[PDB]
Amino acid sequence: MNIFEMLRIDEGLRLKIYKDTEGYYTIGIGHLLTKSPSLNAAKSELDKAIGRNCNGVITKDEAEKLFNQDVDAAVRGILRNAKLKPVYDSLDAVRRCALINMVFQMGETGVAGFTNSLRMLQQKRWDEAAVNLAKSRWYNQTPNRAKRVITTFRTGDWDAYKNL
């Protein structure tokens, strides 16, 4: 398993503009287009992102391209972040994947705020950190996905995704 396959299990693939768990306009493999309530604002961002007149619809090819950009930007964002970089560097390959998924879902900003969990992951206190991560809006709102990520950080292997 790798980061792209993991995220593709978590996010799915939709070739038509859709609403987030949050009600936000998104397309493809979890590509947020706008937090704005107009389908029109969303459509405009879509064509800007793809470089064509999409009319709210994209190809598989286009979805994967956005997904390539998105993953690359998550990693690079982690690397530039003074709070994130040190944890990422301390982690093994699998757990690095679990950090990248949080960042993809919630943004650099959102993850850098899990101060206490970050500290525990750096320390390699896997069980304590899993407990701490679960105490969040994140876990309460998307419990199945949060639990998959959390298991990945606790175990260090891909079993949560084997099922799936």
Swiss-Prot record:
Subcellular location, record wording: Host cytoplasm
pH dependence: Optimum pH is 7.3.
InterPro entries assigned: Endolysin_T4_type (IPR034690), Glyco_hydro_24 (IPR002196), Lysozyme-like_dom_sf (IPR023346), Lysozyme_dom_sf (IPR023347), Phage_lysozyme-like (IPR052619), T4-type_lysozyme (IPR001165)
The protein's enzyme class: hydrolase
EC number, as in UniProt: 3.2.1.17
Consequence when changing T26H: Facilitates transglycosylation more effectively than hydrolysis; covalently bound substrate
GO biological process: cell wall macromolecule catabolic process; defense response to bacterium; peptidoglycan catabolic process; viral release from host cell by cytolysis
Single GO molecular function: lysozyme activity
Entry keyword annotation includes NADP: no
Residue positions of the active site: E11 (proton donor/acceptor), D20 (proton donor/acceptor)
Domain of life: Viruses
Entry annotated with the keyword Hydrolase: yes
Chain sites annotated for binding substrate: L32, F104, S117, N132
Induction per the UniProt record: Expressed late in the viral replication.
Impact after mutating G30F: Almost complete loss of enzymatic activity. The enzyme is destabilized by 1.5 kcal/mol
Effect the entry attributes to changing E11Q: Complete loss of activity
Outcome reported for the amino acid change (mutating E11N): Loss of 84% of enzymatic activity
Reaction equation(s) it catalyzes: Hydrolysis of (1->4)-beta-linkages between N-acetylmuramic acid and N-acetyl-D-glucosamine residues in a peptidoglycan and between N-acetyl-D-glucosamine residues in chitodextrins
GO CC terms: host cell cytoplasm
Keywords, ordered alphabetically: Antimicrobial, Bacteriolytic enzyme, Cytolysis, Glycosidase, Host cell lysis by virus, Host cytoplasm, Hydrolase, Viral release from host cell
Family: Belongs to the glycosyl hydrolase 24 family.
Protein role: Endolysin with lysozyme activity that degrades host peptidoglycans and participates with the holin and spanin proteins in the sequential events which lead to the programmed host cell lysis releasing the mature viral particles. Once the holin has permeabilized the host cell membrane, the endolysin can reach the periplasm and break down the peptidoglycan layer.
PANTHER family from the UniProt entry: T4-TYPE LYSOZYME 1-RELATED
Name of the protein this chain belongs to: Endolysin
Organism: Enterobacteria phage T4 (Bacteriophage T4)
Lineage: Viruses, Duplodnaviria, Heunggongvirae, Uroviricota, Caudoviricetes
Gene of this entry: E
